[PDB]
Design a protein around this ligand. Structure first.
Ligand SMILES: *[C@@H]1O[C@H](CO)[C@@H](O[C@@H]2O[C@H](CO)[C@@H](O[C@@H]3O[C@H](CO[C@H]4O[C@H](CO)[C@@H](O)[C@H](O)[C@@H]4O)[C@@H](O)[C@H](O[C@H]4O[C@H](CO)[C@@H](O)[C@H](O)[C@@H]4O)[C@@H]3O)[C@H](O)[C@H]2NC(C)=O)[C@H](O)[C@H]1NC(C)=O
Ligand SMILES: *[C@@H]1O[C@H](CO)[C@@H](O[C@@H]2O[C@H](CO)[C@@H](O[C@@H]3O[C@H](CO[C@H]4O[C@H](CO)[C@@H](O)[C@H](O)[C@@H]4O)[C@@H](O)[C@H](O[C@H]4O[C@H](CO)[C@@H](O)[C@H](O)[C@@H]4O)[C@@H]3O)[C@H](O)[C@H]2NC(C)=O)[C@H](O)[C@H]1NC(C)=O
Lengths: 438, 105, 438
């Protein structure tokens, strides 16, 4: 047998779907999502660490000179001086007055902890949403996971399900992503081969372990002063230690739809957007034949309380004329109220209790128990608590149906002057047919 | 195999593939008479050369009549007022306008 | 200095870019593309091998009965049969005539050598084009690789090139990829969890070494015939060996724009479509000043042959009047003809030839040697060949613009017929004022 439905995407919200077919009792399902990830389709543009400049020991020469080297290295820069007088610790050091040069050399590379802590820069062009729906019917509760696109298909017990494509294609990321340790940043990073000193991306390597480092940290190599032995230089500071402080927040603290952002297989888990379509394949050995079901006649419901609270704040009472005990399956044929627990146990006496939940002042929902229906009407009252710690179990709908007390006064003003308007027409119809001819 | 202009590749058996492009030769004769210049543009684009020559032919017979239709209109406006009232047809104009009132008309 | 150009996407075809700024000599460039390989962003969805039906020896218990264990394998099929009589080689087997059961089981798993040869089903939704460009100017001759998008930047001599985004967004991969050994079949394979017996994908495991094998091959058992210790089973044969021989041709052998298709990081190299915008950053240490450049005057151009052949059919004797021996950089300025060698030397007497390649009956282009311009003219003839092994080296421009033989007869007819249509309009003003005034 085949059946389709759509469920809203909010987590911790048991949805009920109703199945009707000729020759069997009606049956209700219970789909309830328990988690939802959203992994982008990554590719590392580059990776960023905190650099290390290695200035080796400066090589003097006491009589001759020396020349430049032109080695191959990321930000290599060496240049030789004229005659300097070292004067190390006791007396002089070359024992001349001039013609004693001092070659200086400096370069940069990646860190030593670059494989441990690092910012990782990715690109999010597509995304594949997973889910963790649990499924409840009869005496069967399972919990399966499935990629939410309209072709993957999973089986539960003796039935099979598949989940359609997500309605929208919205991402909390953008096409740019920065992953340091626990905080993806939605910032348009500067691209590869165009790093800027001081700002994020001063050193850039294509993957975690490779050659071909890229760096322009503006390394300048000045001239040594009077008679001490030191190699001085100047450099713009490490960008990556500015970005550890000057980072404002994460993206976990300014995500749009209230979604936590984990980091290690970079994720966007538990969003709240759109709705998910389903497809059912319940076989025939799950229903009950109509002979085995308990026959129900003469329904009549009668409300008691009905507050507007976000939980199941409403209790109804129903009467009936049965013939044998059994187990029915209730359902609501409106999006105004949602009856809880779906699986009542009918007995000999004609009296059961339910629990529903509305959001408007006057409902008009209609209840089917076992192939028999009736309609319920209530007069409801607003609650008192302003801030509640849990979510919303109803559907957001505020409209009195047709016969609420707030709309009954409308029909006693609409029929009043509207019935007097046609009476002013019916005078003119008589006048424009009697004394247009006499 | 039809080798049109962009070439083909073809593999026979287990040999490496071979690509062969098409040269832009023709059958006509360029830089010559106006009747043999159409055949040069006929091996090149054989179906786009008839729709080109028809609009170069329709533009000739239409613009040739529209000069004579302005001649016969301008011929009429110099012969008519000398044809209403009884009077001679002034043979100075006969050399210019070969007027149909020739001899007894 | 900054300059933008749009090279065509033809593999193995030189392009001349020409730079003219204030004060310096005109300088040409010669960019040439060598290879172009685009790859989609794959992600494996399942892996298909052969299967291997395992079945153990059958179990016969002749004193009493037995029952099935009902374990969980992919296609685990138990069925116990009633009273048999085995007839082993020496006499009877189990010393009775009835009341003896026989437990027969068989199931399926993945093949032995599955990690060696295996089909793989990927997904093509984006692309990522790389290229390989030879850059030539002066004495600089290098070859680099770069991603073709507006974010990657390569340095060659001292400049910093950047190749723009592709005009089109065309991929010969539709959405989906099936790779076996050296070939992609442009297929629409069934998704993970919808295998069909005999058609492709009856064995779908999520990756190579993981668990959770999926298989529906319709493994049905039957009872042994009369008196032989065997086990019969019937099931539809291997789908994977259907696909090795029923495959017509890969996408390699029917790809549109001359593409060839490799397989290991699945890709499709040397595809000739679209055009690439570039961005140039040549510094001022590569140009030459107009002081050192030889001033060239009194240009003149005449041709002798002008064959329509595809390579460089046509010679051009060109004279000038110089003062100092030096070096020039020729170029055209119209897409009717293209010029070879781009940098020809000079001599005191003006006698240098050129090799152009045009594709029209009467080309009319214009040549600049060292900021010294002229035009040219030709009377071209068709070649006596039909099929050529090499490819073209000319932009297609079939239009004998304003001076040829095919233009002169048009100007005499339309300048001779149009002169007698407007002449009647002069007579329409000449006579009609004299009549009307009289
Ligand atoms: C349908 O499917 C499930 C399969 O698991 C089965 O029903 C589940 O039963 C388990 C227990 O067997 C339920 O899990 C636990 O229920 C406990 C009972 O709740 C009481 O206490 C809480 C807390 O005060 C009250 O709010 C509540 O009103 C009850 O009085 C909970 O205490 C457990 O809490 C755990 O998680 C919370 C976080 O949510 C932690 O803070 C706790 O420390 C603790 O770790 C937990 O919820 C489970 O809820 C049931 N699932 C259902 C009903 O969907 C059934 O067997 C199966 N149906 C059939 C017919 O077989
Ligand atoms: C710097 O820039 C220059 C020009 O801009 C480039 O120089 C050219 O490079 C190519 C390729 O390296 C050269 O082509 C080679 O020519 C050799 C000799 O050519 C003769 O033989 C061929 C074949 O019959 C004739 O067509 C031709 O007219 C000559 O008579 C060939 O022997 C080479 O073939 C070799 O390679 C191929 C595959 O590549 C093999 O199949 C062959 O067996 C053989 O091994 C090749 O065709 C060309 O001659 C160079 N000069 C010019 C003026 O074009 C540099 O490549 C470039 N970069 C540097 C220097 O790094």
């Amino acid at each position: 047998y085949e059946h389709t439905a759509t469920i809203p995407n909010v987590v911790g919200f048991p949805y009920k779907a109703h199945i009707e077919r000729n020759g069997f009792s009606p049956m209700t399902l219970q789909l309830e999502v328990l988690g939802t990830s959203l992994e982008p389709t990554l590719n590392l543009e580059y990776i960023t660490c905190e650099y290390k400049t290695v200035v080796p020991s400066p090589y003097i020469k006491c009589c001759g000179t020396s020349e430049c080297r032109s080695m191959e290295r990321p930000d290599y820069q060496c240049q030789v001086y004229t005659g300097v007088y070292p004067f190390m610790w006791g007396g002089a050091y070359c024992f001349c007055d001039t013609e004693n040069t001092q070659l200086s050399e400096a370069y940069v590379d990646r860190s030593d902890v670059c494989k441990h802590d690092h910012a990782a820069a990715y690109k999010a062009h597509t995304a594949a949403m997973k889910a963790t729906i649990r499924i409840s019917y009869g005496n069967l509760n399972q919990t399966t996971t499935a990629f939410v696109n309209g072709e993957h298909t999973v089986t539960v017990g003796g039935s099979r399900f598949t989940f359609g494509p997500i309605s929208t294609a919205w991402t909390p990321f953008d096409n740019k992503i920065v992953v340091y340790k626990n905080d993806v940043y939605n910032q348009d990073f500067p691209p590869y081969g165009s790093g800027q000193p001081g700002r994020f991306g001063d050193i850039q390597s294509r993957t975690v372990e490779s050659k071909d480092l890229y760096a322009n940290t503006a390394l300048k190599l000045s001239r040594p002063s009077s008679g001490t032995v030191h190699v001085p230089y100047t450099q713009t500071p490490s960008s990556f230690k500015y970005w550890i402080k000057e980072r404002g927040t994460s993206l976990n603290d300014k995500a749009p739809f209230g979604c936590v952002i984990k980091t290690n297989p970079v994720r966007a888990e538990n969003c709240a957007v759109g709705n998910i379509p389903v497809s059912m394949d319940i076989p025939d050995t799950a229903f009950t034949r109509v002979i085995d079901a308990p026959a129900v006649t003469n329904l009549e419901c009668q409300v008691a309380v009905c507050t507007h609270s976000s939980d199941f704040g409403g209790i109804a009472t129903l009467t009936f004329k049965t013939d044998k005990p059994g187990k029915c399956a209730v359902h609501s044929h409106s999006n105004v109220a949602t009856i809880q627990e779906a699986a009542v146990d009918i007995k000999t006496d004609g009296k059961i209790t339910l629990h529903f939940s509305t959001a408007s002042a006057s409902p008009a929902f209609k209840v089917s128990v076992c192939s028999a229906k009736t309609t319920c009407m209530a007069a409801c009252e607003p609650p008192k608590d302003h801030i509640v710690p849990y979510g919303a179990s109803h559907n957001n709908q505020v409209f009195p149906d047709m016969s609420g007390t707030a709309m009954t006064w409308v029909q006693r003003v609409a029929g009043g002057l509207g019935g007097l308007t046609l009476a002013a027409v019916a005078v003119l119809i008589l006048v424009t047919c009697v004394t247009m001819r006499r | 195999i039809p080798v049109t202009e962009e070439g083909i590749e073809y593999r026979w058996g287990n040999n490496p593939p071979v690509r062969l492009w098409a040269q832009l030769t023709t059958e006509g004769k360029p830089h010559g008479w106006p009747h043999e210049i159409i055949l040069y543009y006929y091996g090149l684009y054989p179906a786009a050369t008839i729709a080109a020559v028809s609009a170069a032919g329709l533009a000739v017979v239409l613009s040739l009549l529209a000069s004579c239709y302005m001649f016969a209109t301008a011929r009429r406006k110099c012969l008519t007022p000398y044809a209403l009232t009884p009077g001679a047809v002034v043979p100075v104009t006969l050399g210019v306008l070969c007027c149909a009132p020739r001899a007894h008309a």
